[model samples]
Target: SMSYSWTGALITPCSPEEEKLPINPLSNSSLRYHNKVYCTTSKSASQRAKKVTFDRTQVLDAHYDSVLKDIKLAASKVSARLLTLEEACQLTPPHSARSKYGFGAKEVRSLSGRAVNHIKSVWKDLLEDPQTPIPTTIMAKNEVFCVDGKKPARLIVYPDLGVRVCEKMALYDITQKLPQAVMGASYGFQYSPAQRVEYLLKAWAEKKDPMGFSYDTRCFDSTVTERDIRTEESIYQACSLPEEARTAIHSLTERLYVGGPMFNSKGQTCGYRRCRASGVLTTSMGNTITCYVKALAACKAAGIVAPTMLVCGDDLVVISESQGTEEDERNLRAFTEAMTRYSAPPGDPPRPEYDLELITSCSSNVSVALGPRGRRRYYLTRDPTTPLARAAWETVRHSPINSWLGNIIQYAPTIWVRMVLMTHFFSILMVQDTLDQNLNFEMYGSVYSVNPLDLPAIIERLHGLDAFSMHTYSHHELTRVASALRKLGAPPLRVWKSRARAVRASLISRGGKAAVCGRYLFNWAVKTKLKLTPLPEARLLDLSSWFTVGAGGGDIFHS
Candidate 1:
């Protein structure tokens, strides 16, 4: 349904414009010279205080300022109310993305007989006997990258039909309640990429973390033992679920959460695997809270102040007070001992970071660069994997859905995203005659008639004007991004720059929303801003619920 002239190019790694003296970007000290770069791998704040402390004001923009204020307010107001089981069940996708059950996913969503009856029986069995193990279905998971440089198929367990229903009941409540309670200011997913950057920057600014370190638990979910699952159930029990609900949860945990049998793709029995199932509703909830519990207790045991912990699944970053280098090292060694003793051994033991930007967690790391407005911006970034780089190629080339929209909004500041994704997507939209006639983007996962015009409101609600307006890239950043694109089979930068300029010119002629986008969205592509146009339609979308609920990862694939 869509076409791009450039579709046949094969994927190859982009050669670096010029390789730095050192092959590893991390070891290269010259790259640090740009924008007053400050980073540390030192064990102690005292070991590196000379450079770690710099002008805190450099990273904050108007967006950061406002977002920080809003986050502060939201954090303070997080309530005690938990989502009921019925409410959580309702959020299940109206159509199943994929399912193993005999009945269709639509029947489950609609509460039809077979699905409901199955769920009810599962609940009844759990209440009848609390200790019987539940069965789980195993599936192969494809991730963008495996550490081995080749895609590896990892096995993940999905909870059985009944256990899935119970998971929804508990998980919805946990996501709604636990993060704010445990992590406080460090809950990463609660904030947008901008807001997450803001909070991390604020901690650096306040010197709350004299030493920053990120932790990696070896095979985190797989490492979760039966005892660990019981520990998680204990936490839920402490929350005081209603009597019957609590009993059922206890039974479910004893039977399912502790461990279960695995089935292969052909529905044949594989050897039983015993661990927390990664694809169930409870996977995220159990991991976050359990990690928090262990880490907090370990911190207290080590006599260190509780670190600012930002955890998503197993990814954890710890920002804590300055301890002298030797003591910092000592505390980390001790913290590792304590953590390991408590059943959460680190894959790589905790070590204080010397380089600020080198501390990575949740697949993203801090990067410092110049922004469009000439101020230093510290944003979260990661190398876009080959698959997503290909996704950008596919979406612009032939995919009917604007799949790039979600990613572009999320990774707006990245070089490949800004230079390639924004340019090509908008260029397609500019000649709206043929493209508009192609009516194929999804709204709320439903195929609704859409315009390129609808994107402004969506962007504003999810990210803000910065996503649409900011266009800034440095030569080195561009070189590396361009290299990555070439490696990932993307078209050349020249092609994108031309398309972006063409879109900008066309948009100026077509005023109103399109013109407004041209001004803010492609300001970097043009010589001067045209007359600023109003987004009068932007007001009609009360996208508040969409934005808020998006913060939580609420799903149970098992059921």
Candidate 2:
């Protein structure tokens, strides 16, 4: 009567004698098919292959490298002032090459087909292999298993910030001593990736060694297993690590270890921690060019004695005082190249004198773009006359940088027109600002507003006019979820009879991208939810027609 079904290396069944071979007392056993564990259904070989296709690492390298160079050349635009969440959100999409699959629902479906195939291939390979005698995995016997069975797991894995972090986490977990996950329909562990690699950098000043991480559930007293608890603990301890460093263990465990003397002071580490904020960092090393902030943070917090040690994806180097070592110039180059992969230098063939201006801001330039951003005085546009441009450039060619706007003469080539398509568009008050401002402002019926920043990056040296699309201006969490269903799902896909019905019953929920995680939550939802699967060869957006599409259930589609 139990809703359990088992499959693994022995799924085909060898012999009663073979089955009685003590299930290998010393051998570790997980749901193994071709001798590999299905701890994380994602890494089951096929997933890896599918990843290869869905991930465009080489192309990214080219994009970032090219873009970075342009930014560097237009160093004036690289303001020191931090980008607000809104500004970041505007740039978030193009910045993300999240998955190789083309953007949108159809592309996602294509990728999904490949993924299903990958899963099938791997599953078959596991069951058919002869080298290993142990079995691999067992899916739930029925589609709808009750919560009583451990097989009913609902594991959700998503990259909270960026795809890069997810890639790193996947790499870390797959290679662990024990398989990193054992998810089922009703019982599963999720990786929210909320607090990413960046945040964990400074936290582990003095934490106890990895130990006792999971308290899965009382029902499956034995469900999570002691080994997994250790794994989780190990992850927690390692995360006390600096930025740019991947935890050797999965992040879920709590058996955290403080890196160096701070945590290990009383000789070796034991599972104990008085407080996370109990310690202070004392040193800095490695080249400004060579070390990533994350790796550097780890060195100081963990008490790593090395002058320079490299983590998997980071560039860390020790430069002697006498020798002027070039920092990660290579990485910087690569990074620059990667960012601009899809981008090309903005120009006309013979390249007649080009004067382009780039502006960055959050909220909205109410007077300039949207009808009126509550009349809270904001900088609209700066003329890029020769004198102004030269003056800005001179201020830039100076000795030391003063502020984010220190050296900069911008032409404002790209006019970010924020049109209010929602409530305020029809308002008499907002309509006044629309006529007053020397900028474009259109009103929408269903869509709320056109994000100013969403305008393609105007900084020349840029290749494409790529930008990120946010769900809408109503950014409220609940609104976004409900909106997504109405916005995306077709008749059958979105079974909710009417928007009013769905909203009234509140059965609607936002998925895919949302502002709830703010802009920081990009990776978690973007890379993980995986709208449609099976990526295409070359994906390009037809930006020329972006503004022509109608709102809500209207036609004229374009990305």
Best by the lDDT measure = 1
Worst 10 residues of 2 by lDDT: 277-286
Candidate 1, 396-425: lDDT as tens digits: 345333446545656776666666776777
Please list the residue runs of candidate 1 whose C-alpha ends up more than 4 Å from where it truly belongs after superposition.
1-89, 94-101, 146-148, 303-306, 349-351, 370-373, 385-405, 427-455, 461-463, 469-476, 505-519, 530-559
Per-residue lDDT over 150-243 for candidate 2, one digit per residue giving the tens place of the 0 to 100 score: 2322211111122222222322222221111111110101111111111121121222221100001111111222232342333223322332
Q: What are the models' TM-scores?
A: 0.73, 0.17
For model 2, the stretches where C-alpha displacement exceeds 4 angstroms are: 1-45, 49-331, 334-488, 491-559
User: How does model 1 fare in lDDT?
Assistant: 0.56
